[PDB]
């Protein structure tokens, strides 16, 4: 029976499958909030040049 | 049929079960000591315990340094990584030399990851958005049909835009991968094939599996692929990533932070049983083309715990190290790196070994040759070089075919040697005749 | 009149190698004359190229300047034909700012390997007898005929879109791709109505198609490996085929492409057509370039390499050492050397005779004798260059043949290297930076 | 055992400096052997580092090849621990096509100075067995917790955020009180019962609103790169940093000082280690002269063997291949060659790390070979001898196995002799 | 130009000038090796630092509800 299946079409035993990439996902780099408050200055000593 | 190349006759190291080298096996003849040493290195690689161990194949030209390195690759098999390289490649215009070396170090570390892929496929029965102000699409409702059933799904707006991507409409057959959000419109269902006599659409059958399928596969990747995929990200859906991808891509000098994080997540995969590590081999042929900066960097790289096994090859004598401008050293390599290396000595071949290799190359290239022509080619090889004698086989066979003969004879080899000259003979013409 | 873009160049007279069926060279044939042994060797190399079994064989053409090394190369190029690749460069061209030398040589290597992709397609080809579109969703109907049969097609919507964008109308002869509905218009069989004003282009007519309206045919497309690399290098990387922004294509892409081309070869889709890479004046290459070539020639996808140089014992660029031909002996062992000898009196005369025929110039026998003696005394190229000048001088005096006096006139007007150097030594104080 | 990504290397056996509380070195401890004076000096430098008061201090470790200076540096790295920065590079690495040599050294300096920040958070937790959430939007957070259930009234203007990122029945989540963020844990067995690699925790515990402090240590280079661009943090991974503008760096120095005086941050000085400094050039050393005069500079450690050697970029010669303008600004630690007993003990430690058993005669022969040729050559023969023993189904390495490996693999002294026996065969002498 | 043997306080005297001027005057320190940039030519680096050593003090009133 298996040999007859092979004789008909090999996909009945070992079908071809689509190739694809390995989705890894993001790395999720953490840090503190004050790091983003650098270069911020204050309204009464900055801007309007 | 595949094309024949210089080392295509090499199938392995030809060692017996006890580790000793047979005189002629697996395409190699002679050089028994170096083959036994290479077998020990094969045992070292397959153990997977060590990191950064280095080897140098050293000897005259034409003695088989490259052949033994490729024989190791045949002995290891295709499952182990084997990243060939030549020392001239480090001089890139995009990135520094040490980055090229480190990238090739990471290419030689393999990783077999079990990945679970969620896929949706079926004929699109209906497609309706749902939107509202927090104005914007909250999600899209889609129905899918297959031979075994049908199902209604709600999906992210990114996949909805990736559906408007393919001009998908009701009645079309699609393939969605939920891991990446990739969408493929295979075509329209075969049910609508008879509805027109002539239409520009391409028709496909209905899918026969379930609407939603959960499949497990094993993916072959290297650490360099993981580094590059996160350094220049490519699988995002934010607008900023799409703008950044419009830039011309170039290689960048990847940091050690990213490589450390990749090592961390790889270790997490290994601890979770998801992944298996397959460390491999880096092969740097003609290391004498590396400069002193490259050699000095290899001191730190070869001392790492992550690094692969490395194989070097060089033919130089007491030559000047490149970049030092007055410092001679053996093999064109600094003494300090050479201390970190096991040296495998390669020897010249006797005339009998030359004849045997010539016969092997003849039967590899599909050439019949008489014993007289074989002895004459052996004499030529002793007089000039092995590689010159091997190269005469195919032209002599072509002349024999032109003459109607089915085999090389001595006169054809004589005629070819008269037509084509070797480096020593040509140099004698330059020096004497001038 | 009608000056096409190709005019009479240095090697325009060469159209082959002039060899017998047994590769035995004729004394003068196909524009080539003399260099019997070198032409025979080039014929053998051409047969090696034609069979295509052996990969990465290298040949060097060596000899003094003016001995026809480049002529033998163009003879091989013309005899080989256009179907097989023949990539020709100078050694100076690899020194790019966009990419490294190894990358440039890799691109040059892969430009010289052809992929003969083959696939089946179905078309519908017929004279448009009638078309109707009921635009208010659109519906329509089309009728096509051949000399044998006619058929009416009920059209789908997207086919109607394609027909409207192409503005297909009756009397046209079209070809419709069944796979995707692309339309291509071959011409018209019936004139447009002469009642219509201003749309009165005369055009030209085309016969009705024969046989079945719908046919299945094989189609063959030829692309180089470099084209496949550049297309797959990045999104919208096809533009770099013309602009040349192919900077440092990643090696993993090339490995994937080689594997896919191999499996296409086994799956019957493609055939590999290995060509030739020709590097004229290879002494400009650096030591790093030759070191890269040593390993690049060991691949199974490598083409046949041909090189031309004239140097004797000469410095290798990038080093302080000297070797034959300005090439290291690492590479000279890997190749066969073809030697070109200086020409005799009769061969020079025959070359000048062939060159006069190419330029459509008639000269007396005394003129041929004088120009032959000039060419032996100074150089072949100088004597060749004097032909056109002497013809112009003859033309301005309304002559019909170039005579000895015209040759002596242009000999006086235009100087060779030896006389110019002598006269420069007379004015040695006047000339700068001796 | 399963192969981790870290495997046994050259310096894996050393795990610290073998020093007692009085910085007096033990003969063999924590994988290190010998080098008593150098180890004591390294301990003094280590205590100088971890106090952190003095800035810009420079040290050089010098000696013949194979004397363990790199091993000493790795021992300092292990003893210091991960809580303090330790940047390690080779001198060849600063020669970048992306940036200048000074910029590379500048950001190598700044990677070695950490800024430690503590941040307070308020977080709510609960098990998603069911969600009775409608989405304006209405909900009551029908989640569970061991102490008492996570039912809680919700503000109607933002409940769509709870349903945004595919919150589904059979999960466990956490919610922030002030940020409003929501995060998931996945197919927990208590909720998902009726996937692989999901959180397999039980029902969560605590009184819902739980306090939590979190500590982040960020280098000055990270602050520079993050604030240099809209998405500059990607450059930390891609390495697409250009030459960072000086204006960004001094503003960040001022802000870090302000945070330090305000008590909102703490400075954690670290170490920069540059192995094989003789690849640096006059320009790099001249930059290092003034880079070490900043208050925000780390401790610098350098290694090079050399003698009187040419400085790169010059025809001048100087001790250690370094100009004497810089050698005045550093302290030199000298490593001496090893004795027979120290060599034997190092081989014993390496065999233990590699899980190799050898006879005492084998140890004697390998110690003879180590003094005769080199230490690293003798260390290399351990693995090869073990492999040769394994193929003959042996249990311990014998003298014959080492002699076999010595015959197969050979060192520079014999390779050079055999090369000189075929001088014309070898190329470009 | 401050000239003399190493260790005689050239940099110390320069920083003493900087301390004596106060923080409200610009003082741009620089090393000669910094001119060798990959992005701009050396003379541009010098001119940029020249402009960096020249200060402008702007006075303005901010009003806000």
From Swiss-Prot, chain A:
Compartments, as annotated in UniProt:
Nucleus
Q: Which residues cross the membrane?
A: none
Name the tissues where it is expressed: Ubiquitously expressed.
Q: Which domain of life is it from?
A: Eukaryota
Subunit text: Component of the NuA4 histone acetyltransferase complex which contains the catalytic subunit KAT5/TIP60 and the subunits EP400, TRRAP/PAF400, BRD8/SMAP, EPC1, DMAP1/DNMAP1, RUVBL1/TIP49, RUVBL2, ING3, actin, ACTL6A/BAF53A, MORF4L1/MRG15, MORF4L2/MRGX, MRGBP, YEATS4/GAS41, VPS72/YL1 and MEAF6. May also participate in the formation of NuA4 related complexes which lack the KAT5/TIP60 catalytic subunit, but which include the SWI/SNF related protein SRCAP. The NuA4 complex interacts with MYC and the adenovirus E1A protein. EP400 interacts with TRRAP, RUVBL1 and RUVBL2.
Family to which the UniProt record says this protein belongs: Belongs to the SNF2/RAD54 helicase family. SWR1 subfamily.
Write out the function statement from the record. Answer: Component of the NuA4 histone acetyltransferase complex which is involved in transcriptional activation of select genes principally by acetylation of nucleosomal histones H4 and H2A. This modification may both alter nucleosome - DNA interactions and promote interaction of the modified histones with other proteins which positively regulate transcription. May be required for transcriptional activation of E2F1 and MYC target genes during cellular proliferation.
> What protein am I looking at?
E1A-binding protein p400
Its gene name is EP400
Swiss-Prot record, chain B:
Q: What are the alphabetically sorted keywords of the record?
A: Acetylation, Activator, ATP-binding, Cell cycle, Cell division, Chromatin regulator, Cytoplasm, Cytoskeleton, DNA damage, DNA recombination, DNA repair, Growth regulation, Helicase, Hydrolase, Isopeptide bond, Membrane, Mitosis, Nucleotide-binding, Nucleus, Transcription, Transcription regulation, Ubl conjugation
Record-level GO BP terms? box C/D snoRNP assembly; cell division; chromatin remodeling; DNA recombination; DNA repair; positive regulation of canonical Wnt signaling pathway; positive regulation of DNA repair; positive regulation of DNA-templated transcription
Task: State its Enzyme Commission number(s).
Answer: 3.6.4.12
Q: In which tissues is it expressed?
A: Ubiquitously expressed with high expression in heart, skeletal muscle and testis.
List residues of cross-link (Glycyl lysine isopeptide (Lys-Gly) (interchain with G-Cter in SUMO1)). 208
Its biological purpose is as follows: Possesses single-stranded DNA-stimulated ATPase and ATP-dependent DNA helicase (3' to 5') activity; hexamerization is thought to be critical for ATP hydrolysis and adjacent subunits in the ring-like structure contribute to the ATPase activity. Component of the NuA4 histone acetyltransferase complex which is involved in transcriptional activation of select genes principally by acetylation of nucleosomal histones H4 and H2A. This modification may both alter nucleosome-DNA interactions and promote interaction of the modified histones with other proteins which positively regulate transcription.
Q: What is this protein called?
A: RuvB-like 1
Curated annotation (Swiss-Prot), chain C:
Which E.C. number(s) belong to this protein?
3.6.4.12
| Tissue expression per record | Ubiquitously expressed. Highly expressed in testis and thymus.
Give the keywords, sorted.
Acetylation, Activator, ATP-binding, Chromatin regulator, Cytoplasm, DNA damage, DNA recombination, DNA repair, Growth regulation, Helicase, Hydrolase, Isopeptide bond, Membrane, Nucleotide-binding, Nucleus, Phosphoprotein, Transcription, Transcription regulation, Ubl conjugation
In this record, what's one Pfam family? TIP49_C
The entry's localization annotation reads: Nucleus matrix; Nucleus, Nucleoplasm; Cytoplasm; Membrane
An example GO CC term for this entry is: extracellular exosome
Indicate yes or no for the key word Transmembrane: no
In alphabetical order, the GO MF annotations are: ADP binding; ATP binding; ATP hydrolysis activity; ATPase binding; beta-catenin binding; chromatin DNA binding; DNA helicase activity; identical protein binding
The molecule here is called RuvB-like 2
- Lineage of the organism: Eukaryota, Metazoa, Chordata, Craniata, Vertebrata
Swiss-Prot record, chain D:
Asked if Nucleotide-binding is a keyword of the record, the answer is yes
User: Any idea which UniProt keywords this protein has?
Assistant: Acetylation, Activator, ATP-binding, Chromatin regulator, Cytoplasm, DNA damage, DNA recombination, DNA repair, Growth regulation, Helicase, Hydrolase, Isopeptide bond, Membrane, Nucleotide-binding, Nucleus, Phosphoprotein, Transcription, Transcription regulation, Ubl conjugation
* Site of covalent link Glycyl lysine isopeptide (Lys-Gly) (interchain with G-Cter in SUMO2): 420
Q: Which GO terms describe its cellular component?
A: centrosome; ciliary basal body; cytoplasm; cytosol; dynein axonemal particle; euchromatin; extracellular exosome; Ino80 complex
Its EC number(s): 3.6.4.12
Give the matching SMART domains.
AAA (SM00382)
One annotated GO molecular function is: identical protein binding
Found, by tissue, as follows: Ubiquitously expressed. Highly expressed in testis and thymus.
The places in or outside the cell where this protein is found are: Nucleus matrix; Nucleus, Nucleoplasm; Cytoplasm; Membrane
User: What are the GO BP annotations of this UniProt entry?
Assistant: box C/D snoRNP assembly; cellular response to estradiol stimulus; cellular response to UV; chromatin remodeling; DNA recombination; DNA repair; establishment of protein localization to chromatin; negative regulation of canonical Wnt signaling pathway
Gene3D superfamilies membership: 1.10.8.60, P-loop containing nucleotide triphosphate hydrolases (3.40.50.300), RuvB-like helicase, domain II (2.40.50.360)
Task: Please list the reactions this protein catalyses.
Answer: ATP + H2O = ADP + phosphate + H(+)
Positions binding ATP in this chain are 63-70
Give the modified residues of type Phosphoserine: 413
What does the record say about domains?
A: The C-terminal domain is required for association with ATF2.
The entry's family comment says: Belongs to the RuvB family.
Q: What is the protein's given name?
A: RuvB-like 2
Species source reads Homo sapiens (Human)
Q: Which gene encodes it?
A: RUVBL2
């Amino acid at each position: 029976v298996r040999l007859q299946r092979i004789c008909n079409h090999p996909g009945l035993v070992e079908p071809r499958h689509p190739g694809s990439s390995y989705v890894a996902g993001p790395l999720e780099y953490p840090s503190a909030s004050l790091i983003l408050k650098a270069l911020e200055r204050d309204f009464w000593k900055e801007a309007d040049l | 049929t595949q094309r024949i190349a210089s080392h295509s006759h090499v199938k392995g190291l030809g060692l017996d079960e006890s580790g000793l080298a047979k005189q002629a096996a697996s395409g190699l003849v002679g050089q028994e000591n170096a083959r036994e040493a290479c077998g020990v290195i094969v045992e070292l690689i397959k153990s997977k315990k060590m990191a950064g161990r280095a080897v140098l194949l050293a000897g005259p030209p034409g003695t088989g340094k490259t052949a033994l390195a490729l024989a190791i690759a045949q002995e290891l098999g295709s499952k182990v990584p084997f990243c060939p390289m030549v020392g001239s490649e480090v001089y890139s215009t995009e990135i520094k030399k040490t980055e090229v070396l480190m990238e090739n170090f990471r290419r030689a570390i393999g990783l077999r990851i079990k990945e679970t892929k969620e896929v949706y496929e079926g004929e699109v029965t209906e497609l309706t958005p749902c939107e509202t102000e927090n104005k914007t699409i909250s999600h899209v409702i889609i129905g899918l049909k297959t031979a075994k059933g049908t199902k209604q799904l709600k999906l992210d707006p990114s996949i909805f835009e990736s559906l408007q991507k393919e001009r998908v409409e009701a009645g079309d057959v699609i393939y969605i991968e939920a891991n990446s959000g990739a969408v493929k419109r295979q075509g329209r269902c075969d049910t609508y094939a008879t509805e027109f006599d002539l239409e520009a659409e391409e028709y496909v059958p209905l899918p026969k599996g379930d609407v939603h399928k959960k499949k497990e596969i094993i993916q072959d990747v290297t650490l360099h692929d993981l580094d590059v995929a996160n350094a220049r990200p490519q699988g995002g859906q934010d607008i900023l990533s799409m703008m950044g991808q419009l830039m011309k891509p170039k290689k960048t000098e990847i940091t050690d932070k990213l490589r450390g994080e990749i090592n961390k997540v790889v270790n997490k995969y290994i601890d979770q049983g998801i992944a298996e590590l397959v460390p491999g081999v880096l092969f740097v042929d003609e290391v004498h083309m590396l400069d002193i900066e490259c050699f000095t960097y290899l001191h730190r790289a070869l001392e790492s715990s992550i690094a692969p096994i490395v194989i070097f090859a060089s033919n130089r004598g007491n030559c000047v190290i490149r970049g030092t401008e007055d410092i001679t050293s053996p093999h064109g390599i600094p003494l300090d790196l050479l201390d970190r290396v096991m040296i495998i000595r390669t020897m010249l071949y006797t005339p009998q070994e030359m004849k045997q290799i010539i016969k092997i190359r003849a039967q590899t290239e599909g050439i019949n040759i008489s014993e007289e022509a074989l002895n004459h080619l052996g004499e030529i090889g002793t007089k000039t070089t092995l590689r010159y004698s091997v190269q005469l086989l195919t032209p002599a066979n072509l002349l024999a075919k032109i003459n109607g003969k089915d085999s090389i004879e001595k006169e054809h080899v004589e005629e070819i040697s008269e037509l084509f000259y070797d480096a020593k003979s040509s140099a004698k013409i330059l020096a004497d005749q001038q | 009149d009608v000056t096409r873009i190709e005019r009479i160049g240095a090697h325009s007279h060469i159209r082959g190698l002039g060899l017998d069926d047994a590769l035995e060279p004729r004394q003068a044939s196909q524009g080539m004359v003399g260099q019997l042994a070198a032409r025979r060797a080039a014929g053998v190399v051409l047969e090696m190229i034609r069979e295509g079994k052996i990969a990465g064989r290298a040949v060097l053409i060596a000899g003094q300047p003016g001995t026809g090394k480049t002529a033998i190369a163009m003879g091989m190029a013309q005899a080989l034909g256009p179907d097989t690749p023949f990539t020709a460069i100078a050694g100076s061209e690899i020194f790019s700012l966009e990419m490294s030398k190894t990358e440039a040589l890799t691109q040059a290597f892969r430009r010289s390997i052809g992929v003969r992709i083959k696939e089946e397609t179905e078309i519908i080809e017929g004279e448009v007898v009638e078309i109707q579109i009921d635009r208010p969703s659109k519906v329509g109907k089309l009728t096509l005929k051949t000399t044998e049969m006619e058929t009416i097609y009920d059209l789908g919507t997207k086919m109607i879109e394609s027909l409207t964008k192409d503005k297909v109308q009756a009397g046209d002869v079209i070809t419709i791709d069944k796979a995707t509905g692309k339309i291509s218009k071959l011409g018209r069989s019936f004139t447009r109505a002469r009642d219509y004003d201003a749309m009165g282009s005369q055009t030209k007519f085309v016969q009705c198609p024969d046989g079945e309206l719908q046919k299945r045919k094989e189609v063959v497309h030829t692309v180089s490996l470099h084209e496949i690399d550049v297309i797959n290098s990045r999104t919208q990387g096809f533009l770099a085929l013309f602009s040349g922004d192919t900077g440092e294509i990643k090696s993993e892409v090339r490995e994937q492409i080689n594997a896919k081309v191999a499996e296409w070869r086994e799956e019957g889709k493609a055939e590999i057509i290995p060509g030739v890479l020709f590097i004229d004046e290879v002494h400009m290459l650096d030591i790093e370039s030759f070191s890269f070539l040593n390993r690049a020639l060991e691949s199974d996808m490598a083409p046949v390499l041909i090189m031309a140089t004239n140097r004797g014992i000469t410095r290798i660029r990038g080093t302080s050492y000297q070797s034959p031909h300005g090439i290291p002996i690492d590479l000279l062992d890997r190749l066969l050397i073809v030697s070109t000898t200086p020409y005799s009196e009769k061969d020079t005369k025959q070359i000048l005779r062939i060159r006069c025929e190419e330029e459509d110039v008639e000269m007396s026998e005394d003129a041929y004798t004088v120009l032959t003696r000039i060419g032996l005394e100074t150089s072949l190229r100088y004597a060749i260059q004097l032909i056109t000048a002497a013809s112009l001088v003859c033309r301005k005096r309304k002559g019909t043949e170039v005579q000895v006096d015209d040759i002596k006139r242009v000999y006086s007007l235009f100087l060779d290297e030896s006389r110019s150097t002598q006269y420069m030594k007379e004015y040695q104080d006047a000339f700068l930076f001796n």
